[PDB]
Amino acid sequence: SGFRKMAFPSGKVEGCMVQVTCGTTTLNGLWLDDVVYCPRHVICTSEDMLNPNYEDLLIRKSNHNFLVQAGNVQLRVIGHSMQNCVLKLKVDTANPKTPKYKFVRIQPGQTFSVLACYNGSPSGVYQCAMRPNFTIKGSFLNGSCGSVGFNIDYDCVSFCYMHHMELPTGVHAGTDLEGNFYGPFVDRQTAQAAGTDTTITVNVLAWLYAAVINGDRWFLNRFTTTLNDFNLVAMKYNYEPLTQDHVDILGPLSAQTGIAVLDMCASLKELLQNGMNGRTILGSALLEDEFTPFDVVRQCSGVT
Amino acid sequence: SGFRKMAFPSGKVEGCMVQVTCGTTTLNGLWLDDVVYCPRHVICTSEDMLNPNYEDLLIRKSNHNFLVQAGNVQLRVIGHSMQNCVLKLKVDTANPKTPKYKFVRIQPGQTFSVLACYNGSPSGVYQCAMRPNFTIKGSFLNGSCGSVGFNIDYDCVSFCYMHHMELPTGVHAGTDLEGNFYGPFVDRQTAQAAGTDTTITVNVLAWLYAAVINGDRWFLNRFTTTLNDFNLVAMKYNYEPLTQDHVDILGPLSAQTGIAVLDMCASLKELLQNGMNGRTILGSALLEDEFTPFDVVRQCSGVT
Ligand SMILES: Cc1ccncc1NC(=O)CC1CC2(CC2)C1
Numbered sequence: 001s002g003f004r005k006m007a008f009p010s011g012k013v014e015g016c017m018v019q020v021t022c023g024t025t026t027l028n029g030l031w032l033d034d035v036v037y038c039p040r041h042v043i044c045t046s047e048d049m050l051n052p053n054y055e056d057l058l059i060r061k062s063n064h065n066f067l068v069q070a071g072n073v074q075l076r077v078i079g080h081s082m083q084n085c086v087l088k089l090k091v092d093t094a095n096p097k098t099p100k101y102k103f104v105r106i107q108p109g110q111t112f113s114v115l116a117c118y119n120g121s122p123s124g125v126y127q128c129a130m131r132p133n134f135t136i137k138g139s140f141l142n143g144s145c146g147s148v149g150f151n152i153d154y155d156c157v158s159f160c161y162m163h164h165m166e167l168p169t170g171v172h173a174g175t176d177l178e179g180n181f182y183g184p185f186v187d188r189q190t191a192q193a194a195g196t197d198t199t200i201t202v203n204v205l206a207w208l209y210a211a212v213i214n215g216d217r218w219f220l221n222r223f224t225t226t227l228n229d230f231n232l233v234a235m236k237y238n239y240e241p242l243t244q245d246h247v248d249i250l251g252p253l254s255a256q257t258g259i260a261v262l263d264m265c266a267s268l269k270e271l272l273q274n275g276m277n278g279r280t281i282l283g284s285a286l287l288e289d290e291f292t293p294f295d296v297v298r299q300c301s302g303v304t
Numbered sequence: 305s306g307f308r309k310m311a312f313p314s315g316k317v318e319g320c321m322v323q324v325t326c327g328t329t330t331l332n333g334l335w336l337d338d339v340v341y342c343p344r345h346v347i348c349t350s351e352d353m354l355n356p357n358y359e360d361l362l363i364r365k366s367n368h369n370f371l372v373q374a375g376n377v378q379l380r381v382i383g384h385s386m387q388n389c390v391l392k393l394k395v396d397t398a399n400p401k402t403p404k405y406k407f408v409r410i411q412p413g414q415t416f417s418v419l420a421c422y423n424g425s426p427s428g429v430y431q432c433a434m435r436p437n438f439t440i441k442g443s444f445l446n447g448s449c450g451s452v453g454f455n456i457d458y459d460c461v462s463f464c465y466m467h468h469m470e471l472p473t474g475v476h477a478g479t480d481l482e483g484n485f486y487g488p489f490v491d492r493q494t495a496q497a498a499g500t501d502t503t504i505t506v507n508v509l510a511w512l513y514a515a516v517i518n519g520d521r522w523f524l525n526r527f528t529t530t531l532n533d534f535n536l537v538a539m540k541y542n543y544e545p546l547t548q549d550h551v552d553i554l555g556p557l558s559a560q561t562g563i564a565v566l567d568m569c570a571s572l573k574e575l576l577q578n579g580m581n582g583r584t585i586l587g588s589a590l591l592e593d594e595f596t597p598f599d600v601v602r603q604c605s606g607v608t
């Protein structure tokens with residue numbers, strides 16, 4: 001009973017968090033095996049920020065300029081390299097707390113947990129969705145750069161995001177663990193357009209199924225729709241078009257509840273057209289799109 | 305930038321989670337030092353559930369009937385005692401991962417993080433508020449009993465909640481770590497009334513301050529109110545009466561934003577009376593009461 005915006009347990013990720021300082025800037029690094037991953041903007045200074053020449057800035061840096069501290073102990077840096085927008089600092093000690101891990105590039109609409117950190121120390125954990133426009137609506141302050149996003153399949157941690165930047169609009173931008181930015185963003189202090197965002201339709205439908213599973217069913221109606229009719233409504237309301245692939249991923253929830261995917265789409269159509277009429281669904285007065293169908297199945301079945 | 309329902313990092317609590325089996329029932333236990341804490345209903349069977357005689361049920365149990373497993377290794381139980389609604393199983397090994405900890409009994413309206421577990425394994429973490437009526441609106445399934453709620457001050461974990469039960473209404477009830485239920489609840493399979501719940505006024509005000517700090521200010525008006533006028537509105541809308549103690553706790557947020565507490569109360573008064581008019585505050589279409597003024601200060605300043 002109950003449905004919460006649940007994050008993965010952050011323990012395996014806390015054991016990887018380190019502090020990285022270069023010059024006067026301190027941020028977070030991720031220590032996996034004998035490598036420390038961090039945003040390359042750690043090598044910048046305030047004059048360099050509007051358009052840094054990272055190649056030139058890194059050339060003036062030697063292994064001993066990168067101060068990496070894992071809690072109270074200092075790590076010895078024996079190599080440094082820039083891969084896209086990340087720095088990889090080779091250290092002489094493999095992290096004893098390295099969990100089984102993978103680097104993955106998530107798709108827009110997928111969810112993940114963020115372990116927000118400052119000075120290499122964890123402050124909190126929350127569940128995020130990578131927006132269709134490749135931004136995240138996180139909670140990050142100066143010093144949070146290098147905080148990571150991840151998913152956990154039993155004992156394996158799939159790292160998918162590293163935080164780099166806060167856009168002038170207050171939304172966040174970052175990279176995969178190979179330093180490739182999600183979206184069109186560049187690591188510069190420049191105004192950058194995030195694309196038009198949309199609501200993650202498949203996730204809203206998954207959350208409507210979660211609502212039915214947990215007793216909230218007032219929104220179920222006597223109607224049905226087609227993918228084409230629904231997609232006309234989705235276009236008008238800035239929702240992602242629903243495809244047969246999305247319908248297929250909703251199969252387990254459709255089977256559990258006995259509510260056909262197109263019947264659920266018709267409920268969503270009526271909610272989009274008429275609103276909630278002052279009512280709530282799973283304690284929310286808006287349509288929630290931060291739960292994937294996989295998240296709903298996992299939470300609704302207690303996968304550990 | 306940004307404001308999220310952030311939970312504490314669960315690492316220190318994951319290292320304490322164990323599985324406890326007695327007879328055919330398996331649930332979660334909390335291993336701190338050489339003691340394993342778990343709900344006493346682990347000793348029950350389906351016939352006993354409508355009104356268990358815990359004293360009699362425990363008498364038929366010996367140390368060897370309590371199977372405690374910490375991951376893959378089995379713990380040796382050398383003592384057992386019932387303290388209120390919890391069982392304390394003395395084990396021969398002190399938990400090497402025991403963090404600095406305290407047992408605390410939280411007040412209604414206070415928040416905490418829950419590490420949901422099944423079979424001694426963590427599945428997820430979320431931030432909760434203890435409702436004014438002493439229930440929690442969690443996400444728990446069969447097997448989650450023994451999952452705990454906590455807060456973290458730097459390196460010290462204050463355990464405040466242990467999950468015991470799901471009421472017929474889908475809301476949750478549990479105890480402090482001395483086995484005292486929060487609320488009038490008893491550990492029996494009986495329909496139990498939770499009191500009339502109210503909205504945590506001080507927390508909504510704290511969240512309105514967080515909204516202003518993060519750029520959402522459309523709700524700020526040209527009005528002010530008094531504690532008495534505001535409390536008349538709070539009574540009508542099932543909000544907790546605001547006291548000078550609540551106003552005092554809002555002092556830091558009032559000082560940061562320069563918005564007097566009574567001016568913020570007037571904004572809340574207008575939102576209660578007129579609604580949101582289809583608008584949102586920090587991505588919510590309802591008034592959020594799960595952030596204390598302490599949570600807002602912590603998140604808004606990046607305390608680790
Ligand atoms: C201030 C803040 C808040 C939240 N997250 C991140 C930040 N930090 C930044 O965005 C500054 C970085 C971006 C850069 C040009 C390469 C320097």
Ligand SMILES: Cc1ccncc1NC(=O)CC1CC2(CC2)C1
Pocket residue numbers: 001345353444445446447448449468469470471491492493
């Ligand atoms: C089924 C479930 C779901 C979520 N949380 C908890 C549960 N479990 C229970 O409430 C069963 C317990 C309560 C008892 C009388 C003493 C047996």
